[PDB]
Every structure is written in structure tokens, then in C-alpha cells.
Subunit: 485 residues, 3 copies
Amino acid sequence: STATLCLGHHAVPNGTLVKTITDDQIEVTNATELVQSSSTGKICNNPHRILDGIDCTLIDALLGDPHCDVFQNETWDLFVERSKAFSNCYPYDVPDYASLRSLVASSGTLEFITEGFTWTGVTQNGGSNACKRGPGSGFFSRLNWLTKSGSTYPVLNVTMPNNDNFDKLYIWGVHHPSTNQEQTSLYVQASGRVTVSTRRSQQTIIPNIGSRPWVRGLSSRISIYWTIVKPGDVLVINSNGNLIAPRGYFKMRTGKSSIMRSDAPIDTCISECITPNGSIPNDKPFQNVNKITYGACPKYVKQNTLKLATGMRNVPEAIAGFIENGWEGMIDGWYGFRHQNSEGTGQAADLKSTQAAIDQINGKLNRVIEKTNEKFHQIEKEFSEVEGRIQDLEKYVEDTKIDLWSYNAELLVALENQHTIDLTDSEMNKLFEKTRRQLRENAEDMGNGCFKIYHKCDNACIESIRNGTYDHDVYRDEALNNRFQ
Amino acid sequence: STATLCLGHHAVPNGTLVKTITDDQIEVTNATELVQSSSTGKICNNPHRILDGIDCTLIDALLGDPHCDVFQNETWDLFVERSKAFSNCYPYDVPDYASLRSLVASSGTLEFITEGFTWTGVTQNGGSNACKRGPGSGFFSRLNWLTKSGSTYPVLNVTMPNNDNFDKLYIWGVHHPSTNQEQTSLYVQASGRVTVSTRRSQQTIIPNIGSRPWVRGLSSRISIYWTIVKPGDVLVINSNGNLIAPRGYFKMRTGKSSIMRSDAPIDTCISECITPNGSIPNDKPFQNVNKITYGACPKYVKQNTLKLATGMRNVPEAIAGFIENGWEGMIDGWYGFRHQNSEGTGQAADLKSTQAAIDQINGKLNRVIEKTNEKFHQIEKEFSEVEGRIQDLEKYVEDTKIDLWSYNAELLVALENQHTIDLTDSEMNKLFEKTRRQLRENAEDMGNGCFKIYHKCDNACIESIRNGTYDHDVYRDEALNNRFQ
Amino acid sequence: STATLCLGHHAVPNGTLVKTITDDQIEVTNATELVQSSSTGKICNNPHRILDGIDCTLIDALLGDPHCDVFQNETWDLFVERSKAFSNCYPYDVPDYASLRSLVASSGTLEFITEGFTWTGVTQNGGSNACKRGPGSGFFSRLNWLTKSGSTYPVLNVTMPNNDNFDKLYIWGVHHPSTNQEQTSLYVQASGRVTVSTRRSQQTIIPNIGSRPWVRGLSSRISIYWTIVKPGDVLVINSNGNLIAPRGYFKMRTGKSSIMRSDAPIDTCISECITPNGSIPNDKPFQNVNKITYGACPKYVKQNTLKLATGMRNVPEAIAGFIENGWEGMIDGWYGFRHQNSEGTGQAADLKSTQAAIDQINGKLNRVIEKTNEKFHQIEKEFSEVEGRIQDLEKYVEDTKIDLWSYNAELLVALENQHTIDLTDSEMNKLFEKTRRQLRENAEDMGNGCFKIYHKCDNACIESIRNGTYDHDVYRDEALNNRFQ
Ligand SMILES: *[C@@H]1O[C@H](CO)[C@@H](O)[C@H](O)[C@H]1NC(C)=O
Ligand SMILES: *[C@@H]1O[C@H](CO)[C@@H](O)[C@H](O)[C@H]1NC(C)=O
Ligand SMILES: *[C@@H]1O[C@H](CO)[C@@H](O)[C@H](O)[C@H]1NC(C)=O
Ligand SMILES: *[C@@H]1O[C@H](CO)[C@@H](O)[C@H](O)[C@H]1NC(C)=O
Ligand SMILES: *[C@@H]1O[C@H](CO)[C@@H](O)[C@H](O)[C@H]1NC(C)=O
Ligand SMILES: *[C@@H]1O[C@H](CO)[C@@H](O)[C@H](O)[C@H]1NC(C)=O
Ligand SMILES: *[C@@H]1O[C@H](CO)[C@@H](O)[C@H](O)[C@H]1NC(C)=O
Ligand SMILES: *[C@@H]1O[C@H](CO)[C@@H](O)[C@H](O)[C@H]1NC(C)=O
Ligand SMILES: *[C@@H]1O[C@H](CO)[C@@H](O)[C@H](O)[C@H]1NC(C)=O
């Protein structure tokens, strides 16, 4: 008699469509989504130290807004700026505001050391009713509003050496009165001047005595400037008037700190990736949640979905083999044998080829993508004002990055799916070729992916063929007799 | 007797060389140029609304140059800025000119709403002989040149609330007189000041009273500034002098609008992609025409040609099959059979494998590159002045983008050509293996991509082999007798 | 009798692990490092014109520091800016210093043409003891310190037309005296003003009368500004006072020039690639030395090693063929035959398949990566100050470029290694299939990448099989008799 041993691969009834280099949409047994398209809606407070700016802007906490005194000496890995954040202090503008916000966020600390600045001949601790600290007028806690003492405002000329071994951030301000009457009343000089300089840098501000929109009852402003005094350098403040002096310096730092605009609530949970939408799992290589990211985050891509073939071609369902169709009834392994001999039909999965395919597919993605791009401080990617050239450059850089990484994701997923499908096909063909080699002249490929063994092949001989210990010479005579006679 | 059945693939005499991962220049039956290296030289006026700035710069049309009154209330999807554009009005400079040009181009409209600004104690509608609107002195139509009324220039202090639901762009200016005599004659104050501010922003400009190069007969200038008033915000203009006030505001839009410097004529034609060279077709995924693009444009690459293999190998031309040579004489399909039997030689293309290869090759490039990157406003990529850091950053960002996308194009073309070649080879080999399987023991492969069938194979039998309905058992006895006896 | 003919591939005892798309670490016979991870520590003075700024900053050489007069009229392709560079002249700051440094580096020349500027009513060649040119007081050699002549400082008003065909760079300065007494003594005007303008540009600077840190004995500063005068344009300098006028112009160039901050000594050596680490060989496509590069440099990648498989899979060691193991003892070629016949065992490498594999592998890398991205002037990539938005954008652009190119290198190496391994496997399989085709029915594949030929196969017959001139019909009768009888 003649037995019919042959090979096949597992098939699933519910396949999943993936995109390859050669096929637009090919069904495979298994696939995994490589894009994190959803977020939990909350920012995890671990492992990063998240500082929620409930009603406070980062610059508001920096200056010492009366409603931002809880953020004094605060440190963060990510400062979260809520859209409800508002200023309740003296109206102010920060020329080059974005740079100050960026560098204070990167510093990651509001640690403020008060310094013994000596202001002779002027009244310190000038307050306002726009800045109401308690039941009375106040001002920014980190800024000293100096005004004329008596009937004269001398030329303040103070020095502060940076004898420490770290950069000192001095946040000072220039008062812009609404009228010349206010300018003279606060500062006997009809036109003030504030030159804050270091041995290498310099910033001169001429106060602007002009009316402007009422903000919290004031048509005067404070223009906020910052001076970074590196170690060994010295800060000289020379003011003829309109000086909102610094009460000290902020300890600048370098690290993984940044700032995020987000309304996502902070939740007791752990996630190394934070987006304005909330924290997302970084298990997947790519995301479609937000281009704004903090921590170990997946690369942002424009694709909502990128399915990676983690299985083989799905060819759902006479024991014809892989060339005809896949085997739905085989669950022990990926590739296996079905045999029909005198002892009845049987099946047995091939563990060697199954494990080869599984091992090859296991780390396919993780070996072409670095562990995870861990980004902490970045450029601004959403803007509320129309700034122009610099904002356009930031938007263009981010769009270029997004387009290039989205193309990388598309090409990589197509390449990896093509390689997975070709690899599973090659494993099936390799097992078929091994079986053919074992069955040198004792079998014949029926053409449906199925061999026809021309000798009585009991289950023991089937097992011998399956495990590679099949000796063709034993049955060569009988097989040849049944084949060519 | 016996028969011959050789399997082959179509070949063309006029092959085309392509680049693959494995071969530097491999000849293929067909290839398509993937780089749009040429342009029609004229900008299509569809589907985008192209506004040709014949003799006007965008800022010239914005300010209301007398020779640019045809651009009043103008809208555009692309503003074309001719190199012959010139200014014929009061000489002016725009501090951060690039930013204003960028944001006005992005806004995409010159829609100007005149507002009831009230300037008390000053003479309005000041004009100069440099701006000759008609037979007399004129000025920018969108700017009001305020001067002293009689012998006094009071402290102008006006407000304009933004009660609408859109951003208001206020283009104002500061007059820079040639001499103190002119400053006092126009503005009794010896030193003017223009503070234009919102509840959040502020811009105070001190006029510069100094002579400078004559431009249209004037050594005075206008420094042009813009204020964007968001909805609910209020614009306050406080001028001690030298105020070139706004006559209103330009309504700000957000959309696909931009500006292009181009001398390409406008043509009654349709093209979704516009370059300074002119409109180019976006059928190809890459273009080597211009890095400056607008609309649904191909990605810019440094390659002047990237041929993508849309066919298979050429092995140009005893009927040996694919292993030996390609078949020049087969035009019906890509793969086919040539048979020699007692009834004479014949040929027949294999439609199944041909269609498989054609379908696999049809969308190879499409299923790895997004439809088309539709970019509307971008960074400036060509610069006429040496600005320095920001211009260097823009040039670096564009050069990095160009290099990365050029590498992407090289790698993609090489990968897709390698896959096309391997795919056509695999189709040929799969057809050969199918024919082998059908001819289990009836035929022997002669090594030239062909089979020697050892039984009388009439045209009906050859057709049965070709269509897969060949029964080996019918001729097994005769074939074995002719083979082994 | 019979014979054995096993096909195999060369193996090396010391393989090298490379990385593929399918295997994390696969041993190949040969691999080459694609990342230049090391530098010679010195800057080659060829082929680039390296100018070593020993103790001079580029701006120090530009202004004409007394200790930088050796750099007058100097030209360079790369200006090397040592960390020991110091200023020994009048203390100064350059508002927008980075832009001036960038544009002077891009120009690549300090060629200074002295111009006949006429300053009437002021004292020229003003000096200080901060700039000691010799034993007496000095000043910047390219700047004229103008002061009051006698007891009056008239309103300087000079013009300089650009009648040449090149851009003229005018480096001027504004004096910032420490006290009003110094301002009046040097400049009778209590408040100076310096307006330097062209027909299209304008820079007006108000001198800053305020004290500041002593630098070389002076609490006064020079604010350095530059004006680029296009051909046909004219430069007008007006000054009430505080004018550090230009003595001429620096001739602008466009080309391959740039500036590098490096302490690597310049050595008599040739290298087209320069890094702050020193010159590196550009033979490899990628580097891990420095993201800051000049000349034809390898792309910077984060990977310190990327091994590209320049050989085949290594399978180190009855003459079983390729299926079992690789051939350690075969050095003549890559693929070969080992035969056992009545005349004894022998071996012979296959030159055709070996050469096919070698030719395909030779240029795999260089037909997908452009020769060398020759980058000369680009953005600053290392910053000593915390500047903010623009510096953050530069850092983000460079980090994006580095990440994208590192992913490109990783994916490219994985793809090329996968293709090389599949290529060598396919060459071995193609040799096996050719040998099978030649031995139509005279040999049987034993399953170990080897054939049992069932006829007397002397060395001549084995050579005929190896060179493709083997006629199966000669031995078909004997082989069939030995096979099936
Ligand atoms: C902040 O830290 C400084 C550091 O010494 C300390 O002097 C100061 O009292 C602290 N203030 C607050 C509010 O924590
Ligand atoms: C201002 O202070 C600096 C150092 O703080 C000093 O060198 C200078 O003499 C002072 N000037 C006056 C006028 O006091
Ligand atoms: C995240 O937020 C942005 C902006 O609010 C929004 O455009 C995007 O759709 C959000 N994505 C998810 C997944 O919530
Ligand atoms: C522009 O539109 C406004 C809208 O009211 C109108 O008042 C004005 O006259 C228009 N100008 C032109 C030139 O069409
Ligand atoms: C200027 O106008 C603002 C409102 O526009 C007003 O609050 C302020 O009192 C005015 N100032 C003077 C001096 O009239
Ligand atoms: C397009 O124009 C640019 C600049 O004028 C030129 O460098 C380039 O060669 C042009 N290309 C084509 C295809 O016309
Ligand atoms: C620099 O070149 C100019 C060009 O004429 C020349 O006049 C000047 O003397 C040169 N100076 C030096 C120091 O070489
Ligand atoms: C200043 O010089 C310019 C030419 O450079 C001239 O047109 C103008 O009249 C001069 N002004 C005075 C006040 O001399
Ligand atoms: C090159 O120098 C940089 C900065 O000093 C350093 O981080 C890097 O490790 C150096 N690389 C080599 C190869 O010396």
C-alpha cells in the first residue's frame, strides 16, 4: 500500500489584514497594532514628577503671583499648564516670553535664593491693588518694586557677583507707567532706564510712558526680562528709574524637565510617556495621540493604524497541504504534518519550524526601532498667537519630522510585513524541502503541497519522517516497486 | 515519442536600466520615472486661486501702495510675488519684514475693514510726493499719516475693542523724519513715541530722527509694525508723535494660503502643485524641480531621475525557457509556455501568473508613500539677504529635509525595484514549480527552464498542462516507459 | 560504483555577528564597521584651508583685536575657534552675536577694504588702555572711535555708495559710556544716537549711559552692529554721538567656508572631513564622532557600531554540503564542490557563483547612500549660553536629524545584511539547482546539500559537472540501472 504524509500551516478563521510591500491588504493569522491611537485621558504622576499649574502659568509661578505662592521653590519633571491658568497680579509682558518659559521649564525648578540686594535712596516692596497678597496691596513675591524714597530716586547701581558654581537666573522687570505724572511720582526722573548687565551680556530697557488697556485696573505694565549669570560672572543693575528689581536668583538646572499645556487631570498611575491628551503606553513603536510628548514616548505618526503581521499568511480551509490551503484545525503549532496511512488519519505539529518562525517574528520590530526615543524638552508645537517667521519655522520643523517619521512607519511596517510573510512562506517551503530530502525516491509531491509515500508507512514511520530520523533505504525497494511498476 | 514544454517570460529589445539593492544597474522590461524633473514653465490658476502681484510686493499691497490699489480686499490661495515688484510709495522698512509677509500670506486675504479711529488735534491723511496716487501727493491707502493740527500735536490716545470673533491685524507705522526740523514741523514734540498695545502685548517705538539714503526723494522712513488683536481684546494706540496710524484692520483667516516668489506666467491650466518654476504634475511621488512648492506637490529630492521597475528582467533572445533567455516574441502576457509536440511548435501566455505579477507591481509605490503631501504655507527656502542665525536655521532645516527625503527616495526605489525583480523571478519560478507538480513523473526538467515530457503530448494535452487540468496518471505508464526504459 | 558531489560554501573560524531584519545577531563570514567611531584627534590642514584662531574669536579677528592683527585679511575654509580664545580689547557685546559670527564664518574672509570715510568736526582714532596695541593705548583696527573735536561733536552724516558688484559688510559700533560725565566728555550730546542705514535697511541705536561690570578696567561697552550693503546700495551713517564708526568694509563671499569650535591641533595631514574631535576618515557612511561636521563627512548616527555583512552566513564545520555546515577548509572561493569518487576525494571552488555574490555585495552600501553629504556651513549644535526659543529650535532640529539618520542607518544596515544573507543563500541554492539540473536523473539529492551520482564519476566527469559541460545522456543508462535496479 501507499501512505500520504504531507505538510501544512495553521490558519485562523478570523484573520487580520496587513499592508506589505507587494500586497495592498493581505490577510494574516495574527497582527499587532503598532500605533498608540488612544490615551487614558489622565497624566500619570509617575515616574516623572508632574507639577500641576492649576490656575498658574509657569511665568506666573516664576514671578511670584499672589495666587501662585504655592509654587515657590517648586521642582518638576513636567510642568502642566492648564488652559484655565490666569494672571491675577500686576499686568506684565515678557519680551521674548517663549524663551523665558522654555528655559524656566528646562531648568525644572523654581528654587529661588534671596540675595542681599542693597537699594539705597529708594522705597522697596512697592505694591499694587492688582496684586493683592492678602487684605491689602501686594506685588510679585520674587520682584522688588523700587520707587523714590521721599522726593528723590537716585541712580541705583548695585552689583551681585556669582561666586557659586551654577548659573543664576535673575528675573527683573521694567515698569511702564501710563502717564508722565505716574512716571515722575514713582520715579522723579521724567524718563527712567534699566541697564542690567554682566561681564559679557547687557540689557538696557527704556520704560515706555504711554497709556494702554486696563488690566486689573491698571494701564501700566511690567516688561519682564531675565539675566543668566554664569559662575564667576557678576550682575550689575544700574537704574535711573522704572526698575522692578530682582529679590534674588533662581537656581538654574539642566535635566529632563519641560513644560506641557494640558487639561488632562493628574491620576495616581505610572506611565513613562505623557501627552497633552494624557499619559499613553509606550509599548508600541508609534503613536497617533499627540505630536507633543514628554518622556519615553512612541514616535508620532500621521497613521491612525499600522498593523504589523505577527503571524503568517491566512489561507482558511483529501488532506491537501499548504500549497492548497491553510489548516484551521491545527493549533499545536504553526507548521505541521497531516498523514493518511493504513492506521488512519493523523496530525502532528512541527515544533522546529514553528519555533524558528516565532523566534524570527518575535523581535522583528524591536530590532529596527531603538528601545524608545526619550524626549524631555522640545520645541513648541501648538501656538496660540500668530508670531510669524520663528513660529513658521517651528511648525515646518515639526511637520517635516512628522512626515518623515510617518513615512518611516509606513515603509517599516510594509517591509516587516513583507519579510514576515516571505519568512513564514520560506519556513513552510523549508519544511517541505526537508521532507522531500528525507523522502528521496520513496515519495512524490502530489502538487497540492502533499507527498505520496509509495510504501506502507505506519505511524512509527510517520514519526520518523516528522522528526527527521527517516531512513529511505529501508523502504526504497518497496517504494520503487510501487512507484515505477 | 516525446514533447517539450518550456516556460519563459516576455522580453523587450528596448530595456531600461534601474537600480536595486543588489545590482547597480539591472535591465528591466519597463520602468517609470519617479522624479518630476520638468515643469510647464507657467503657473496654473486652478484649482488654487493664484493672485499675481504684477508689480506689487505682498507688503506693498497690504500697506496700500498707490500702484497696488488693485489688490485691495484681495484674497488668494497663492500670492505670486514677481521679481519685478517694486515700491513706489513712501520709503519704509518692516522690522521683522519676513514675519509680516509670512503671516499676511498665511492669512490669504487683504480684506481691510475701515474703523472709526478718532484722532483729535492732529491733521489726518498726510501725504508725500513719493506716493503719488493721482495729480498730487498721496500716501498708503491703509495707513493714516497723522500730523500736528495747527501748531500742536496732542498725546493721541485712542482705543478700538475687538468685539468681533476673529483676529484683527492692525498695520501701523512710525515715521522716522530726516531731521529734527522735520520732526518738529510734523510733530511739535522733539521726540515722538508710538505705543500700540493690547491687553496681552505691547510695542513701543521711538522714532529715529536721522538722515539716510534718498528713496523717491525722501531721507525719511516709515517703520511698519503690526498688532494682532484677538477677539475680546482691545487695541490702544498712544502716540506722542510720529504715528502712521492704521485706518482699520485686515481680517485674519487661517487656511491653505501662502506666498511664492516666481516669475512664471499664469496660464489657463489646472495643476494642484505649483513651483516657482511653474506648475508641475503631481502624478510622480518625487520632483526635482524646486524645493519651494505649494499644494499637492511631490516630495523634493536631489535625484534628477529615479526609475522604478514596473516590469521584470530583460534577458533578450531550441525553445529554451526562462533559465536560459527571455522571450522577445511573446506579447500576449508576461509569462508563458512554448511547446514542441508532434503537432508542431506553439506558444501560449500564462494569464494567471502574468496578472499576479501585474497586480503586485501596479500599486507597489502607492502603498508605501501617502497619496501626496499637500503643503500650503512653508518656511522661506530662498533668501536674498544674509540674515544669519534664523536664515541659517531655515536653510539647515530645508537641507536636512531634502537630504532625508532624497535618501528615502533612493532607498525606496532600490527596495521596490529589488522586490519587483524578486517578485517577477518568483512568479516565473512558481509557474515552473506548478508545471513540475502537474508533471509529477511524466516530465524531466532539462535545466533550461523547460520540461521534456516523455509521452505523446498533443495540443490538447499541452493546453491541459497550461490550464492546470493535466492528469499525470493518464500518461504515467508511457512516460515511465520512455524515461527508464 | 557511484560517486558523491557535495556543494558547500566557505566558512571562517572567526565569524562576526551582524544584525538583520529577521535575526537579532547572525554570524557572517565577514563584516565591516559602517560607523566611524574614532578620530585621529587632529585637524587635517588639507584639502580645506584651516585657519586656527589660536587666542582669537572670529569676531575678535573681525573687529581687529590688537592680539588678532595676525588675522587681518585672512581667508579660511574652516575657522577653528579654540576654547582658550579671549578678548584683550575694549569690552564689547554683539547684539545678535551668533548671526554675525555665522555670516562672517560663511563669508570665509577677513579681507578688509579701508574706505575714505570723512568725519568732520570729530576726533578720530580714539583709543583706550583696554586695547594695548604696543605700549600705548589702542583700539580695534577695523573700527574708528570718533570723539568730539575740541569742545563740540557735530551731527556726523556720511555716505558711502556701494558702486562695486559685491556685498559690503560694514562693522560699526555704538559706545555705551558708564556715566553721563563720560558721555558728555566724549560726546557733547547728553544722549547720542547712531543711525546706520541703507536704501532698504536701517539700524538706529541709542547709546546706553549706565555702569556695568569692569572688563579690562572699563565699565563702558561697545555694541557691535553690522550692515550689509548690496551692490548699487548706499550706506548712510548719521550720529549725534557714541559712534564707533567703520574704517571700511569686509568683502563678502559665498562658498564652502564655516567656523568650528575645536581644541584639536592642526596637523600636516589630509582629510575631507573635520570634526571638533579632529579629522576623521569619510570612507564609512556614518560616524559616531561628532554631530558637528565640516566637509565631506559621514552622517552622524547615535549608533557606535553598525556592522554590514560583507560575507555570507557563517556555519562552521562524510563531506556533507551547505545544508549541513559551511566549509572551513575551502579558501579558493565562496562556493564550491567536494567530490568523492574512485579516484579519491577532491575539492574545487565555484568561481562563477563566488564572483556573482562578491560583485553583488561589493557596492550594496554605496548604491543606496550618496557618496558623502558635503556640508560646510550649518547651524550651531553646541551652545554655551541658555538662549531659549531659537537655541531650543536648533537643538530640536539637530536632534530630529540625528534620530532620523540613526534610524536610517539602523534600518539600512538591517536591510542590507538581510539582503546579503538571502543573496548568499540564493547563490548557494542556485548552484545546487544548476547541479541538480545537470544531473537530471543521474544523481539523487541526499538532503545534506549534496548529490549521490549513480555512475562512475571520475575527476574528468566531476570537472564537467562543475563547469556545466556535463552530459547526463552519456551516463543515464548506468545511473538509472544503479538507481532503480
Ligand atoms: C526657598 O528656598 C530658599 C533656599 O534657602 C529659602 O531660603 C527660602 O526660605 C525658601 N522659601 C520657600 C517659600 O520655600
Ligand atoms: C557703579 O557700580 C560699579 C560696580 O558695582 C562701580 O564700578 C562704579 O564705580 C559705580 N558707579 C558709580 C557712579 O557709583
Ligand atoms: C489629543 O488632543 C488634540 C488636541 O486637543 C486632538 O486634536 C487629538 O484628536 C486628541 N487625540 C486623542 C487620541 O485624544
Ligand atoms: C473692501 O470691503 C469693505 C467691506 O465693507 C468695503 O467697505 C470697502 O469699500 C472695500 N474696498 C474695495 C476696494 O473693494
Ligand atoms: C487713554 O485712554 C485710555 C483708554 O483708551 C484711558 O483709560 C486713559 O485714561 C487715557 N489717558 C488719558 C491721559 O487720557
Ligand atoms: C527651477 O528654478 C530654479 C531657480 O530659478 C533653478 O535652479 C532650477 O534649475 C529650475 N528647475 C527647473 C526644472 O526649471
Ligand atoms: C588688506 O587688503 C587691502 C586690499 O587693498 C589692502 O589695502 C590692505 O593693506 C590689506 N591689509 C593687510 C593687513 O593685509
Ligand atoms: C545728510 O547726508 C545726506 C546724504 O548722505 C544728505 O542728503 C542730507 O542732506 C544730509 N543732511 C544734512 C543735515 O546735512
Ligand atoms: C568628541 O568630543 C565630544 C565633546 O567633547 C565628546 O562628547 C565625544 O565623546 C568626542 N568623541 C570622540 C570620538 O572623541
